[PDB]
Design a protein around this ligand. Structure first.
Ligand SMILES: CCCCCCCCCCCCCCCCCC(=O)OC[C@H](COP(=O)([O-])OCC(O)COP(=O)([O-])OC[C@@H](COC(=O)CCCCCCCCCCCCCCCCC)OC(=O)CCCCCCCCCCCCCCCCC)OC(=O)CCCCCCCCCCCCCCCCC
Ligand SMILES: CCCCCCCCCCCCCCCCCC(=O)OC[C@H](COP(=O)([O-])OCC(O)COP(=O)([O-])OC[C@@H](COC(=O)CCCCCCCCCCCCCCCCC)OC(=O)CCCCCCCCCCCCCCCCC)OC(=O)CCCCCCCCCCCCCCCCC
Ligand SMILES: CCCCCCCCCCCCCCCCCC(=O)O[C@@H](COC(=O)CCCCCCCCCCCCCCC)COP(=O)(O)OCC[N+](C)(C)C
Ligand SMILES: CCCCCCCCCCCCCCCCCC(=O)O[C@@H](COC(=O)CCCCCCCCCCCCCCC)COP(=O)(O)OCC[N+](C)(C)C
Ligand SMILES: CCCCCCCCCCCCCCCCCC(=O)O[C@@H](COC(=O)CCCCCCCCCCCCCCC)COP(=O)(O)OC[C@H](O)CO
Ligand SMILES: CCCCCCCCCCCCCCCCCCCC(=O)O[C@H](COC(=O)CCCCCCCCCCCCCC)COP(=O)(O)OCCN
Ligand SMILES: CCCCCCCCCCCCCCCCCCCC(=O)O[C@H](COC(=O)CCCCCCCCCCCCCC)COP(=O)(O)OCCN
Ligand SMILES: CCCCCCCCCCCCCCCCCCCC(=O)O[C@H](COC(=O)CCCCCCCCCCCCCC)COP(=O)(O)OCCN
Ligand SMILES: CCCCCCCCCCCCCCCCCCCC(=O)O[C@H](COC(=O)CCCCCCCCCCCCCC)COP(=O)(O)OCCN
Ligand SMILES: CCCCCCCCCCCCCCCCCCCC(=O)O[C@H](COC(=O)CCCCCCCCCCCCCC)COP(=O)(O)OCCN
Lengths: 75, 218, 85, 64, 387, 443, 57
């Protein structure tokens, strides 16, 4: 319903407001994505930017995996 | 947000269609009624009655242009010609009547060709307007040197295409457009619900295409 | 209203004095008392405009709530505020 | 080559990742407040001032 | 009890004292009347109520009086201001008719009085044509008011007869195709009355429209006529007075687009920016600032004319008035060409500004330099300000 | 932000210097563009490449005008801050200095804005400056100035109601919330295509460029070619692709055929040109068509390759304009029939002309080679034939490039003497940038 | 005689060139390029994926 979507949006806004992280961790290189059952993840902007950062991380890691394996295969 | 690897909004889509957004506590439109002449003029099932309903308006444009040209010709008349009142009346009425009849002819040809192609193809789309424009512009462009028998069908077809895109297709595409209340398909963002659509005292050329766009009146 | 409206008004007064000199064929620094009076008037004019910003927001929220549009308390602070943004 | 190592240390000392996150959150909050205010304002009715039915709730005193 | 009407008694007493003071000053052979002008400005402030539009008109007329020098011209402008102020408070067609007719008579007499040199007969000719064209529009207003009064039995402004009253109002704004009286006036009448005619009556009539007018019709064909005719006419006319007359017709077409789609906030913002530009335009002595008027009347982005056009475009797109908006955008693209002609004429040219010899050295540099700071108003215009 | 206010106020103090101090006026206006180059280099130092996509954010309340840095904006800002002091070395009057200073303020603020209405306000506020720069009275052309201003105004006027349509639809023009709301993408997509297909020269709305880029002075040509065309590309990458992606998929056959015919027909037209500046001016249309198709492919690393081609073009084509400007300044013509044997009379200038000719034809050890290879990787991944069209037509670019070089450089030696120290140092930063970005661009 | 632009040209473009050199050669590697952030994280994932692929065979 609309009320449940609104309460979920309020919870997400409260969580991302009071968020912090230290000790060698970059925010916007998150360890895990945020799992959701939302129709169109862009309904919640904080979740959309978080999963965008996670997806960027995975694309660059897969490029690096390709380079390591190419060096091994050349050897 | 912005990376050189990809564009995340190009692959982040809804998996299901959405429900209709509630925009106000009252969901009935308020508007002034359309006159019956324009209601009858919209009907295309009788091609002849469509042309009869629409052509006098297009003849009004030729009447206005002919009255302009007739006054501008009358002002330049020397006194030896202007005092002959029967000859003056037949000259000026000839100019006005030729312009009015030519405009009415072009309008009737356009409306009849439009409704004929409409009824022949069994569906309403932009092809009937393009064909009617090509026919009317070829009627206007006949007998003239040659950029013109191609240029005038193109101009009348372009007028038909602009008419469809601006007056019909874009209002149909934006029927669910809301400027007030909750953002459509983003009701979780929490924008408040007003008791009614906004009351606007607009002119008769600006009327709500959907009952929820605004309430028109005073 | 806007926090930096008085400084904007002072820059407006300086440009006013410079233009009044340039129109009459004088160099930009001539008659600095004209610059000072222009700066004072620009400061108070743009502070009055910034006050009208808050006044207009207050009028909009008051009229909208009297008509029946109930605004939640998380959004009423966007309007009923002398915000010095 | 020690200058390069010390400049690397200077970069790491000056960068503050939590301050970057707070900058991002404040940007989003300011933009969201602007959007919310503008969306509420856009319920903008318009009739003449003498329309006593569209302006039935205003406290208006007339001298006539 | 008449205690609620002291401002009216004050108006009448002030006029009675001002005529006698002007008579006593002229019996001394005073060739200047700055004291009379200051008393006129004080009287203007003392009779104006505490509304935004009333004080906008009051401050505008106080600024305008610095370009007028004779006693009779000051009296005619005060009695035109009475009509301009009280038309904003008119709730009938009786007071509407009287205020409009007082304004027309004052304008006609001022056009006759202030002309000088070889342009005297041209100004008198254009004033006569304006009076004759105004008489028949006044007759149309009276005739259809009599029709409405007979049909309804009251003074309510409802029904089919309001269409002709609307046409009367469109005549008073110089809306094409009833525009040629203003085109005739721009070519001959001096610059101070042209400055007066482009600012104050438009404000007065649009405030009456905002305050007490409803009609069940449209003004869209007059929007199309005004925008296309004004743009093409200003593109085609080499005289600068005709250029500015046709560009004024284009601007009143944009203001009518703002009226037609409701949303009077964009109307008021664009009208205020236009009035400040007019105050700059007709008091220019340095011709380099003529280019600032050009870039701010073409709607170029950082200056205030862009903002005044762009809220009109925004509200038109909000209520989906697509065809009138497309015509407005085409005419905006056309208007840039002749505003660039203005910039070519007066910016890419050597600078010459003659000094004063008989005193009064460049006497309106204060107002023109103050109005050029419409490059600093855009910071306040972007906010929700005019609503 | 405080730094930007200080840089603007320092730059605007050129007007207050009395004109009789010539040396001071020259030094002040040159330093006023040197300082932003240092500041943008420092911004590159401050950037965290493993951090967020948007860094160094600032938003100015409820006035729109919000700013942020990503990679494309940062590379383009670095290129603009390189190009503006070279323009300062090619001007001689305070009017020119002030026009280019105002242009630098507007370009730098437009490159990193995050608001669509802010982008509209900041970009086409430069229109009247471009009109006065191109239609200057004794040696410009008013026809060219009218063409560029009217085409840009036409596109911007198509965009403006659609901008306001999405603003009424969601409540903001901020790109971070415009990308997360539901909007009518066909209308706004057509408005954005209308502006950015005029800014990038895409046929049929491309006829302003051959007139304007030739009628401009050498500094104006350097700015217009190297900078102002790329505002359409950054418009695509920053505003249109994130906010209307459904439109960006559905318009792909139309944008694709526009890019293909622009590339082919503009390359065919370049062969029949007889003016050296018109030869250099046409060649930019085909490169921008390759940029636009690589942006619209969205396939492998499309933003990266397209930005790299924008940088490679912005380095190579201003240098060709500089060499043509030297020839025009010291021979008073731009006509090919008046030039022959320039190798014997200007050996250094002809060597620079040959190197930048090879760079413009995307030969290796120039950044254009890497750029065109990666752009064709991005195009190939959608379909092989869309890459084949650009691959097989490489003889047509080399034909005009080598024909122009061989006609003006070899033969009977006639023409001006070799370059001065000042002309060599106008050319030199572009050459160093090309050698670096074509040999070791990344680490 | 030194031309008027020469000290300022050499200071500006030389300080840009030295600054670009120091960006490439003195920034931390993770701060210079994200491929240095992901190169060690890809290697451990590849270590725990090679033996998965060994067991699948
Ligand atoms: C202890 C310290 C001593 C105090 C020093 C005061 C400064 C000198 C003022 C000189 C003066 O009074 O007469 C000049 C001059 C008359 O002398 P003049 O040269 O013989 O007259 C020339 C003509 O013959 C004029 O002939 P006239 O006599 O008929 O002129 C009358 C004059 C009036 O002068 C007088 O009649 C006397 C002046 C006051 C005397 C008492 C003050 C003490 O007319 C005016 O009203 C001038 C109007 C100019 C603009 C005023 C403000 C406009 C505001 C509107 C807004 C525009 C900007 C807004 C921005 C836009 C935003 C959108 O009068 C003026 O121009 C008055 C202008 C304003 C004066 C007030 C200045 C206050 C601001 C602070 C000054 C900062 C500098 C400090 C100096 C010290 C360190 C550097
Ligand atoms: C109870 C009501 C009391 C009277 C209020 C209405 C009368 C206002 C008339 C007035 O200010 O007379 C100017 C008169 C100056 O005329 P003037 O110095 O004999 O003539 C010299 C030339 O005009 C050449 O000098 P100018 O053109 O540079 O100066 C002309 C004049 C005014 O020039 C202008 O008209 C341009 C000023 C633009 C600012 C407009 C403010 C509106 C802003 C709207 C904000 C809401 O200068 C001023 O700004 C004087 C302002 C003095 C205070 C005004 C209150 O000011 C005064 O003598 C003081 C009048 C203030 C009350 C006594
Ligand atoms: C879309 C990505 C941006 C790439 C654009 C192409 C740049 C052209 C040249 C390629 C150089 C590659 C440099 C790689 C290392 C430098 C730092 C870096 O990582 O790049 C920055 C930006 O790089 C730049 O700004 C490069 C500047 C290039 C401009 C050079 C031209 C100007 C010089 C002119 C000549 C000067 C000579 C003067 C000497 C006399 C960020 O890009 P990404 O790594 O994709 O960002 C990561 C994304 N995320 C945060 C979301 C995880
Ligand atoms: C001068 C006073 C009036 C200026 C009003 C300008 C309004 C807009 C007009 C069209 C835009 C023109 C902008 C050009 C700016 C660059 C330029 O050329 O500046 C000028 C001066 O421009 C300025 O006024 C600069 C200051 C204003 C902008 C900077 C401060 C505010 C930001 C330099 O002097 P010259 O061209 O030699 O002046 C001679 C004048 N004439 C062409 C008529 C022969
Ligand atoms: C009307 C005024 C003119 C037009 C508008 C100009 C708007 C200002 C320019 C753009 C402002 C943002 C600069 C880009 C950036 O990343 O800035 C950040 C980094 O600051 C910089 O290093 C800014 C460098 C400025 C110069 C670089 C080029 C940008 C635009 C140049 C304008 C001046 C050019 C002069 C040319 C002669 C912000 O720093 P901050 O501390 O204010 O923000 C942090 C936090 O959110 C607190 O708010
Ligand atoms: C002048 C010509 C007018 C004319 O004949 O129009 C017909 C009746 O429309 C009218 O003339 C309608 C006006 C009738 C009086 C009101 C319809 O013309 P049509 O449909 O027979 O045209 C067939 C051509 N292809
Ligand atoms: C460039 C852009 C397009 C320029 C021309 C547009 C012409 C059509 C304008 C149009 O349809 O708008 C109407 C405005 O009233 C009108 O324009 C009423 C015109 C009435 C027909 C006139 C026939 C000839 C009369 C005698 C000559 C007078 C001059 C005629 C040119 C009412 O729009 P809508 O309500 O359908 O919009 C529905 C969506 N919101
Ligand atoms: C510094 C200038 C140079 C010096 C020379 C001075 C020139 C003379 C004075 C200015 C002349 C131009 C003014 C034109 C009239 C504009 C104001 C009309 C009123 C208006 O917009 O409506 C009110 C908003 O007021 C507002 O707050 C409107 C904001 C201002 C609009 C003008 C924008 C351009 C500046 C709302 O009225 P309400 O809701 O209270 O009414 C309900 C009760 N009936
Ligand atoms: C005029 C400015 C744009 C310049 C290029 C216009 C090209 C024509 C538009 C092509 C759109 C694609 C298309 O055909 O889809 C339409 C989508 O409707 C729509 O939504 C129609 C929107 C198209 C116009 C949007 C451009 C507005 C730009 C700003 C204009 C100024 C203010 C508004 C007057 C209707 O599909 P179909 O009928 O072919 O489908 C057949 C099956 N049913
Ligand atoms: C002098 C240039 C010496 C060579 C420098 C070089 O190739 O560095 C590249 C960057 O170029 C530059 O840093 C060139 C900047 C100076 C322009 C030319 C002088 C890539 O750097 P690398 O591959 O050595 O970096 C590895 C550490 N991550």
């Amino acid at each position: 319903s609309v009320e449940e979507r609104q309460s979920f949006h309020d919870k997400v806004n409260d969580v991302f407001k009071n968020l912090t992280g230290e000790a060698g961790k970059r925010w916007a290189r998150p360890d895990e994505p945020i799992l959701h059952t939302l129709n169109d993840e862009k309904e919640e902007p904080h979740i959309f930017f978080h999963n965008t950062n996670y997806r960027t991380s995975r694309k660059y890691i897969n490029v690096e995996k390709t380079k390591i394996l190419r060096e091994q295969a050349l050897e | 947000v912005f990376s050189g690897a990809f564009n995340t909004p190009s692959s982040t889509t809804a998996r299901e269609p959405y429900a209709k957004t509630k925009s106000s506590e009252a969901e009935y439109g308020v508007d002034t009624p359309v006159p019956a002449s324009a209601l009858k003029a919209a009907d295309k099932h009788d091609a002849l009655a469509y042309a009869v309903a629409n052509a006098p308006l297009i003849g009004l444009a030729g009447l206005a242009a002919g009255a302009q040209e007739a006054y501008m010709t009358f002002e330049r008349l020397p006194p030896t010609l202007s005092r002959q009142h029967f000859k003056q009346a037949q000259l000026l009425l000839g100019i006005i009547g030729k312009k009015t009849a030519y405009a009415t002819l072009l309008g009737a040809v356009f409306s009849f060709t439009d409704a004929t192609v409409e009824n022949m193809r069994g569906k309403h789309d932009m092809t009937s307007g393009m064909v009617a424009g090509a026919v009317t512009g070829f009627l206007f462009g006949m007998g003239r040197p040659m950029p013109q028998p191609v240029a005038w069908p193109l101009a009348f077809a372009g007028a038909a295409v602009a008419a469809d895109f601006i007056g019909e297709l874009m209002p149909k595409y934006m029927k669910d457009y809301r400027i007030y209340g909750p953002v459509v398909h983003r009701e979780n963002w929490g924008d408040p619900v007003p008791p009614r659509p906004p009351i606007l005292d607009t002119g008769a050329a600006v009327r709500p295409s959907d009952p929820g766009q605004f309430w028109r009146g005073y | 209203g806007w926090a930096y409206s008085g400084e904007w008004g002072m820059l407006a007064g300086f440009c006013f004095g410079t233009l009044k000199n340039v129109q009459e064929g004088k160099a930009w620094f001539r008659r600095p008392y004209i610059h000072g009076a222009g700066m004072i008037a620009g400061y108070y004019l743009f502070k009055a405009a910034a006050d009208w910003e808050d006044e207009a927001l207050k009028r909009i929220i008051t009229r909208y709530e009297r008509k029946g549009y109930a605004i939640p308390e998380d959004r009423k602070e966007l309007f009923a505020a002398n915000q010095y943004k | 080559a020690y200058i390069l190592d010390f400049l690397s240390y200077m970069w790491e000392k000056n960068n503050d990742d939590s301050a970057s996150y707070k900058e991002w959150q404040d940007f989003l909050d300011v933009a969201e407040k602007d959007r919310r205010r503008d969306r509420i304002i856009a319920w903008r009715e318009r009739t003449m001032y003498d329309d006593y039915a569209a302006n039935a709730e205003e406290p208006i005193i007339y001298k006539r | 009890a008449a205690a609620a009407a002291m401002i009216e008694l004050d108006l009448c007493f002030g006029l009675l004292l001002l005529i006698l003071f002007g008579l006593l000053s002229l019996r001394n052979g005073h060739v200047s009347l700055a004291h009379i002008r200051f008393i006129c400005q004080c009287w203007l402030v003392m009779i104006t109520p505490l509304e935004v539009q009333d004080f906008a008109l009051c401050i505008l007329t106080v600024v305008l009086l610095q370009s007028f020098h004779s006693f009779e011209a000051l009296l005619f402008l005060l009695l035109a201001y009475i009509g301009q102020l009280y038309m904003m408070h008119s709730c009938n067609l009786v007071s509407f008719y009287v205020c409009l007719e007082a304004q027309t008579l004052c304008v006609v007499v001022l056009c006759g009085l202030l002309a000088r040199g070889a342009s005297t007969s041209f100004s008198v000719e254009a004033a006569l044509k304006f009076l004759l064209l105004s008489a028949m529009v006044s007759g149309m207003a009276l005739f259809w008011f009599s029709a409405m009064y007979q049909r309804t039995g009251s003074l309510d402004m409802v029904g089919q007869e309001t269409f002709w009253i609307l046409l009367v109002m469109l005549f008073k704004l110089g809306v094409a195709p009833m525009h040629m009286w203003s085109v005739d006036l721009y070519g001959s009448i001096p610059k101070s009355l042209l400055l007066y005619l482009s600012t104050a009556p438009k404000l007065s009539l649009f405030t009456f429209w905002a305050s007490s007018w409803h009609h069940d019709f449209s003004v869209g064909v007059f929007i199309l006529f005004s925008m296309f005719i004004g743009s093409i006419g200003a593109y085609g006319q080499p005289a600068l007075r005709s250029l500015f007359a046709y560009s004024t017709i284009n601007e009143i077409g944009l203001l009518l687009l703002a009226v037609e789609t409701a949303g009077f906030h964009t109307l008021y913002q664009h009208l205020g920016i236009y009035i400040i530009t007019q105050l700059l335009l007709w008091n220019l002595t340095d011709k380099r600032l003529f280019a600032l008027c050009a870039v701010s009347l073409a709607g170029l982005p950082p200056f205030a004319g862009f903002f005044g056009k762009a809220w009109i475009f925004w509200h038109a797109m909000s209520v989906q008035a697509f065809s009138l908006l497309a015509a407005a955008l085409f005419c905006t693209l056309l208007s840039l060409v002749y505003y660039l002609r203005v910039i070519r004429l007066f910016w890419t040219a050597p600078v010459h500004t003659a000094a004063s010899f008989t005193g009064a050295p460049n006497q309106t540099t204060l107002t023109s330099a103050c109005a050029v700071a419409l490059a600093f108003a855009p910071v306040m215009l972007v906010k929700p300000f005019v609503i | 932000m405080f730094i930007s206010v200080l840089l603007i106020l320092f730059a605007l103090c050129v007007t207050l210097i009395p004109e009789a101090h010539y040396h001071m006026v020259r030094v002040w206006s040159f330093v006023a563009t040197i300082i932003p180059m240092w500041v943008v280099t420092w911004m590159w130092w401050n950037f965290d490449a493993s951090g967020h996509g948007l860094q160094m954010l600032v938003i100015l309340g409820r006035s729109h005008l919000a700013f942020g840095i990503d990679g494309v904006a940062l590379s383009l800002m670095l290129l603009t801050t390189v190009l503006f002091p070279i323009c300062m070395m090619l001007l001689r009057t305070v009017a020119g200095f002030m026009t280019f200073i105002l242009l630098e303020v507007l370009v730098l603020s437009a490159l990193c804005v995050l608001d669509l209405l802010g982008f509209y306000i900041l970009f086409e506020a430069s229109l009247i400056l471009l009109f006065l720069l191109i239609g200057r009275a004794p040696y410009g052309s008013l026809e060219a100035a009218y063409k560029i201003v009217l085409y840009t105004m036409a596109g911007s006027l198509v965009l403006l109601p659609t901008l306001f349509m999405i603003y009424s639809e969601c409540g903001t023009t901020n790109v971070l919330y415009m990308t997360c709301a539901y909007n009518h993408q066909t209308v706004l997509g057509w408005g954005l295509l209308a502006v950015l297909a005029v800014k990038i020269p895409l046929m049929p709305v491309h006829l302003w460029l051959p007139e304007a880029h030739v009628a401009a002075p050498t500094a104006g040509s350097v700015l217009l070619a190297g900078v102002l065309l790329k505002l359409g590309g950054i418009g695509f990458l920053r505003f249109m692709l994130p906010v209307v992606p459904e439109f960006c998929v559905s318009v792909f056959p139309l944008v694709s055929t526009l890019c293909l015919v622009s590339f082919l027909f503009s390359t065919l037209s370049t062969l029949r040109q007889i003016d050296l500046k018109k030869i250099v001016a046409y060649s930019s249309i085909a490169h921008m068509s390759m940029v636009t198709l690589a942006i619209f492919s969205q396939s492998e690393f499309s933003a990266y390759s397209s930005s790299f081609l924008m940088i490679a073009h912005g380095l190579i084509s201003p240098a060709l304009f500089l060499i043509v400007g030297i020839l025009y300044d010291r021979a008073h013509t731009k006509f090919i029939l008046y030039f022959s044997g320039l190798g014997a009379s200007m050996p250094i200038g002809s060597t620079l002309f040959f190197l930048f000719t090879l760079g413009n034809l995307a030969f290796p050890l120039f950044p254009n080679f890497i750029a065109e290879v990666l752009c064709m990787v991005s195009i190939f991944a959608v379909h092989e034939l869309l890459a084949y069209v650009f691959c097989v037509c490489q003889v047509l670019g080399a034909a005009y490039g080598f024909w122009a070089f061989n006609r003006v450089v070899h033969g009977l030696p006639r023409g001006p003497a070799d370059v001065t120290r000042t002309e060599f140092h106008t050319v030199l930063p572009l050459l160093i940038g090309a050698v670096w970005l074509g040999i070791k661009p990344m680490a | 005689k030194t031309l008027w632009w020469e000290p300022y040209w050499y200071a500006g473009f030389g300080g840009m060139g030295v600054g670009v050199y120091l960006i490439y050669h003195a920034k931390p590697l993770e701060a210079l390029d994200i491929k240095y952030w992901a190169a060690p994280r890809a290697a451990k994932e590849l270590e725990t994926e090679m033996r998965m692929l060994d067991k699948l065979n």
